[PDB]
Amino acid sequence: GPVAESWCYTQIKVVKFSYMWTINNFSFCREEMGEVIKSSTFSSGANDKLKWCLRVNPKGLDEESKDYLSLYLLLVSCPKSEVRAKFKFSILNAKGEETKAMESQRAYRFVQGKDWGFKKFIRRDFLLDEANGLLPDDKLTLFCEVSVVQDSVNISGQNTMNMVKVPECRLADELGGLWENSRFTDCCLCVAGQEFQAHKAILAARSPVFSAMFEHEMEESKKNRVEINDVEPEVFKEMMCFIYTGKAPNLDKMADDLLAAADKYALERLKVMCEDALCSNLSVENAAEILILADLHSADQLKTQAVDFINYHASDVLETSGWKSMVVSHPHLVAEAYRSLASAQC
Amino acid sequence: VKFSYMWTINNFSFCREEMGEVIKSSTFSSGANDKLKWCLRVNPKGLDEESKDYLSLYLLLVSCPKSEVRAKFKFSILNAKGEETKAMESQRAYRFVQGKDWGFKKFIRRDFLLDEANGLLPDDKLTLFCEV
Amino acid sequence: GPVAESWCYTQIKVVKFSYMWTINNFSFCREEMGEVIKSSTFSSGANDKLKWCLRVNPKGLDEESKDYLSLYLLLVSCPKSEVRAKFKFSILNAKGEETKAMESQRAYRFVQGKDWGFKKFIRRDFLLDEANGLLPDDKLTLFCEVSVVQDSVNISGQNTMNMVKVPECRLADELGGLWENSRFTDCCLCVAGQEFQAHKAILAARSPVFSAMFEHEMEESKKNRVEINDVEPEVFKEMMCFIYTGKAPNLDKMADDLLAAADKYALERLKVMCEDALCSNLSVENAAEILILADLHSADQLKTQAVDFINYHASDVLETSGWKSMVVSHPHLVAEAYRSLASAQCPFLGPP
Amino acid sequence: ESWCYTQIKVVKFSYMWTINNFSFCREEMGEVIKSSTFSSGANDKLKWCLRVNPKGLDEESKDYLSLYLLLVSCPKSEVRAKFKFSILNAKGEETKAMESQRAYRFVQGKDWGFKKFIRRDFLLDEANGLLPDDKLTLFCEVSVVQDSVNISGQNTMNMVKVPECRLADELGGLWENSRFTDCCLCVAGQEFQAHKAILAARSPVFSAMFEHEMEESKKNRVEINDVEPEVFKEMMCFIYTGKAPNLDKMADDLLAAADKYALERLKVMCEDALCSNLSVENAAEILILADLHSADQLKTQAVDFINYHASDVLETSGWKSMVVSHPHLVAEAYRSLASAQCPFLG
Amino acid sequence: VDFINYHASDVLETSGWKSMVVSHPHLVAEAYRSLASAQCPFL
């Protein structure tokens, strides 16, 4: 593969839908042939405007099928002109593996109110057979995989590439490299007895809390020495590193107290990146202090994610001494735990 | 005057259409002239039914200030590693007027491309070496 | 005819437009075995979203249309939506009337570079037969129509049982009645010795020129007596009716003097309707006077359509007495007519 | 509607050249023939040269005489020119000379013509009458068919814009500016300025009180104490503009103002707003207001609503109040409950 | 320079080329040297 003077990359955007659809007590189908069971609407993150609903007929929709479970796919909302897609259906057996996958080799076009699917999907008696385990405890599980493909674009990567080198924006690294040189420092800064020689000009520039704190009746007298004792210098230097370079690479070792510093200094980005570090570090023995830090820092999304962790692991996390401690310390969070596990879950 | 062009198509197994449909590339040229614009056109299916089950490829001239350009082209399909496979040469400097197509209608079989043991369709992608 | 409470008015709105050729010395081209002759890129006319160009072959490609003509429609650029339109083709004679209608029976699909078209459009021997009279100076005229659809929009009702109704606005009707009754008016208005009545409040709010005369110190002392003699009462009554009401019922019979009055008093809306009526009344015999009136009263679109008409019909107006009056009265208009004629239709001796 | 016209003008020129002593020029000089070049076309920019060879250059064309159109330089590099040379009938010749039926493209630095014109011995034989005074005149008229692009005439008409009437917004702006006001309306201390003719045309009550001879004092010193300032500015906004945008939250006392000042259209829209607002709690209140203000259709619709919710209106305390206050409203309610219904079996 | 070296059939026709010839003879010298170095064959 040699190098060409011009090259084109025709890219077609592909988005996928994964979908569960489980019906309990199916033997109480309560209906004759030709009846329908709709589904709730669902989509994905992007663009979240194309909503889809599933239709399943327990008995034969047609006379040629009769003893056939027929499964269709429906579209209800297409604000664009038209979207065409492929689909692949597979029923989960008792163990959970995808069995009897039927898919269409045609990329059928869909309009609002149009259906496609497999009326001749699976035999009724083959479903009712117990040896293959297609009906575990009268619970049928339908796995729906949707391959929606989108408009195609071309980037036109032709040469005459402007051969002189193109640097990126140096607002970040030039500010970062000024810290170790320690130039243009007009004042002092000491935290926990350790000197970190710094100026106020960019420190107030890149944090609105510190600027308002500096300008109100304190830069006239105590601009040289400012009292900051809420954090250790190891977290303070990372906070000023995020101020200067724009990034905080040292995250996983000390996300717990950088979250507290960010909650103190009202830095939402530093709050949520520590939230990302702790959400992947959600565990059974850690969840109590995860809730206490989420509630103390008012991180609603992290708190809700940790409540969902409680919902998924409620069998073994209740007996922890951490949970005994957070009950005897914070009954209110236990009250919202009751509210979430009762009202939202049921 | 020579041309080199890498046209890469992804997710080709999602062919997206039925028989008798065309796919156009981006308009491209070289440094000199950069006034003769060209574009490649492919059919995933057969263009016409006398040569069915084929990947028909043509070269479309879109822009020319003058009338007719003599040009010799040679199509090629890159396999998994990158060699030139199924290299077919148009032996004549064909007659390129504004809006004229030239190519091999019976270029390569659809089933022969779909044979993944040949390595001719790697990662559901096909890229072409076009020299004019 | 039964009626209901609710209505839904979904519709497939069509954008529809036409495209023209007249290939000169067609028998002298001989594009054989698919030699492509393209045309200009053209859009719908309403905005610029899709563009096309037509492709013809006198000797059609392949052995099928060897003795037949091939006719095809090529697509330049469009958003990817599988645009589906119906098209027709025809041949026009020297008299500008359709002769040979061959129409595609379905709305065909279209994409980037797709070429649908009515092949074997006309036999080559019948087309080369000059006895049909459809080739003036060996020119073949092609007329094409297209029926692009943007794939349906719906309106959701709403129109409930709607027990209460509301009347229409009567403001303009009662203001026209105020003018007809001529009540509560304190300022007098003379035209040509026939005396009228109008007040400042309606005049200043709808015309800047009356607003300019009335407020400049005349209203303190001589608010009654006015000096208007450039217009007649027969045009001034319709002027005053349009000022009070906003509507001009009598316009076709008197669009000349009303255009003059609207140009003098800077009534933009009345200038619009007067130019509309005069353009509807435009013809060959009054072309000289409509050019004179439009160029005198600075009617922009009226003089634009006037010069377009005088370029399209230049062969029958020069012999009349109006042109012989124009060439001696307004020498500049001959220069602008020459500038419009020698660049729009016949720029560089094509057509000769 | 485009008049593309595919305009195909040819660049043809007249040319005069006289050949002398053509019978023995082969024995005079030979086969290498060079003639003078001539300039023609667009301002003589195009170069062409015409000459007749008495004998072919190589061995193959020794039989047929050569008439080659030598072309040193092409007009444009890629030209499909179907060239048609002609002879201006010095004798009778329009056939038997091979004229170029199919030509070839002319490029820079290359010549194209035809290598065969007539048999040499047949031309030398004077019995065929092909030697007019031993001199031939050439009239070369090159026909170039390359230029076809273009001529667009959009033939666009658009009719005229025809702007709409803006009189309602003009009167709204006339209120908002308050110019040339003749009367002053004092409402709750705050004084507004309005136009006497506009108020007389819109409302008949103001027209009557501007006509019943109280002119010397009640023009500027008329008092309006029975209304609130915002309901007054809303009803007068309806008087001037023709619309009442804020009517939805204040339809009731605006209906009172419309009743007091004989605004029928404002009365019916305030009737509509309370008509599509009825509930079981305040139905008696709306009926009291409708009967007090003589709102006939709102009264009828309220009576129908009370009839259709007769089980729930009677439970409200407002119903008791209108029972003890207003007898004939209950009488008409009974009349519409009984006379507009019945017989209902037993 | 790459634009000029091909489109010299119209770029050198304009008066700007004669202007930079008469104003900057060293540019003419280096352009002619580059052309002579590039076109080693041909008379």
Q: Any idea which residue has 């020689």 for tokens?
A: A197
Half-sphere exposure of E27 (CA within 13 A, CB side): 10
What is the C-alpha to C-alpha distance for residues C88 and C111, in angstroms, rounded to an integer? 19
Q: Which helix (H) or strand (E) holds D320?
A: helix D317-325
What is the C-alpha to C-alpha distance for residues D261 and D255, in angstroms, rounded to an integer? 10
From chain B, pick out residues whose CB is under 8 angstroms from the CB of A4.
Answer: 4-6, 129
CB distance B66 to D76 below 8 Å: yes
CB contact under 8 Å between B33 and E6, yes or no, is yes
What is the distance of C-alpha D121 from the center of its chain? Answer: 73
Q: Two tokens at D82?
A: 């179907």
Q: Where are the beta strands (DSSP E) in chain C?
A: 14-23, 51-57, 70-77, 83-85, 87-92, 102-103, 108-110, 115-116, 140-149, 188-191, 194-197
* Burial A189-214, CB ≥16 within 10 A → b, else e: bbbeeeebebbbebbbeebeebeeeb
Q: Which residues pair with D66 in a beta bridge?
A: D53
CB contact under 8 Å between D153 and C344, yes or no, is yes
Instruction: Report the candidate in B97, B39, B89, B104 with the shortest Cα–Cα distance to residue B70.
Output: B97
DSSP 8-class letter at C42: B
Q: Two tokens at C210?
A: 């009356």
The minimal CB distance from D201 to the residues C25, C178, C305 is found for C178
Whether residue B11 has a cis bond before it, omega within 30° of 0: no
Residue of E nearest to B35 (CA): E7
DSSP string, C257-326: HHHHHHHHTT-HHHHHHHHHHHHHT--STTHHHHHHHHHHTT-HHHHHHHHHHHHHTTTTTTTSHHHHHH
Q: Which residues pair with D40 in a beta bridge?
A: D46
Q: Two tokens at E12?
A: 């050198």
Integer-rounded Cα Rg, in Å, for chain D is 51
From chain B, pick out residues whose CB is under 8 angstroms from the CB of D146.
Answer: 66-67
Whether residue B33 has a cis bond before it, omega within 30° of 0: yes
Burial (Cβ within 10 Å: 0-12, 13-18, ≥19) of residue C89 = buried
Number of other CB atoms surrounding residue A80 within 10 Å: 12
Whether residue A2 has a cis bond before it, omega within 30° of 0: no
Q: Two tokens at C157?
A: 């009702």
What is the C-alpha to C-alpha distance for residues A113 and D227, in angstroms, rounded to an integer? 56
DSSP 8-class letter at D165: P
What is the C-alpha to C-alpha distance for residues C225 and D185, in angstroms, rounded to an integer? 32
From chain B, pick out residues whose CB is under 8 angstroms from the CB of D78.
Answer: 64, 66-69
From chain B, pick out residues whose CB is under 8 angstroms from the CB of C38.
Answer: 98-99
Q: Which residues pair with A16 in a beta bridge?
A: A147
What is the C-alpha to C-alpha distance for residues D250 and D255, in angstroms, rounded to an integer? 9
From chain C, pick out residues whose CB is under 8 angstroms from the CB of A81.
Answer: 81, 151
CB contact under 8 Å between C55 and B24, yes or no, is no
Q: What angle do CA C219, C225, C229 make, to 5 degrees?
A: 120
What is the C-alpha to C-alpha distance for residues C339 and D3, in angstroms, rounded to an integer? 19
CB distance C240 to C299 below 8 Å: no
What is the C-alpha to C-alpha distance for residues C56 and C127, in angstroms, rounded to an integer? 14
From chain B, pick out residues whose CB is under 8 angstroms from the CB of A104.
Answer: none
Half-sphere exposure of C264 (CA within 13 A, CB side): 15
Q: Two tokens at D320?
A: 């008791």
Q: How many CB pairs under 8 A join B and D?
A: 16
Distance from the first to the final alpha carbon of chain D? 77
SS3 for D181?
Answer: coil
CB distance B110 to B54 below 8 Å: yes
CB distance B22 to B43 below 8 Å: yes
Query: Residue A341 to residues A313, A314, A335: CA-CA distances in angstroms?
Result: 12, 10, 10
The minimal CB distance from D297 to the residues C164, C170, C351 is found for C164
SS3 for C238?
Answer: helix
User: In units of Å, what resolution does this entry have?
Assistant: 4.3
A6-23 and B4-9 as β-strands: parallel, antiparallel, unpaired? parallel
Q: Two tokens at A340?
A: 């979430």
Cβ partners under 8 Å of residue A213, min gap 6: none
Q: Two tokens at A190?
A: 């000491």
What is the C-alpha to C-alpha distance for residues C106 and C147, in angstroms, rounded to an integer? 11
C112 touches chain A (CB under 8 A): no
What is the C-alpha to C-alpha distance for residues D254 and D263, in angstroms, rounded to an integer? 10
D159 touches chain C (CB under 8 A): yes
DSSP 8-class letter at B120: S
Half-sphere exposure of A113 (CA within 13 A, CB side): 0
CB distance C66 to C102 below 8 Å: no
CB contact under 8 Å between C166 and D9, yes or no, is no
Q: In a mutagenesis test of the D interface, which of C18, C20, C220, C271 is the best target, namely the one with the most D β-carbons within 10 Å? A: C20
Residue B22 identity:
V
Burial (Cβ within 10 Å: 0-12, 13-18, ≥19) of residue D116 = middle
CB contact under 8 Å between B21 and C111, yes or no, is yes
From chain B, pick out residues whose CB is under 8 angstroms from the CB of E6.
Answer: 32-33
Q: Per residue, what are the HEC states of chain A?
A: CCCCCEEEEEEEEEEEEEEEEEECCCCCCCCCCCCCECCCCECCCCCCCCCEEEEEECCCCCCCCCCEEEEEEEECCCCCCCEEEEEEEEEECCCCCEEEEEECCCCEEECCCCEEEEEEEEEHHHHHCCCCCCCHHHCEEEEEEEEEEEEEEECCCCCCCCCCCCCCCCCCHHHHHHHHHCCCCCCCCEECCEECCCCHHHHHHCCHHHHHHHHCCCCCCCCCCCCCCCCCHHHHHHHHHHHHCCCCCCCCCCHHHHHHHHHHHCCHHHHHHHHHHHHHCCCCCCHHHHHHHHHHCCCHHHHHHHHHHHHHCCCCCCCCHHHHHHHHHCHHHHHHHHHHHHHHCC
How was this structure obtained? cryo-EM
Q: Do E and C have ≥3 inter-chain CB pairs under 8 A?
A: no
Whether residue C351 has a cis bond before it, omega within 30° of 0: yes
Number of other CB atoms surrounding residue C163 within 10 Å: 12
Query: Residue B81 to residues A2, B52, C215: CA-CA distances in angstroms?
Result: 12, 28, 89
A238 backbone φψ class: left, alpha, beta (φ>0; ψ -120 to 50)? alpha
B37-42 and B23-24 as β-strands: parallel, antiparallel, unpaired? antiparallel
DSSP 8-class letter at D78: S
CB distance A39 to A55 below 8 Å: yes
D 9-48: CB under 8 A from B: none
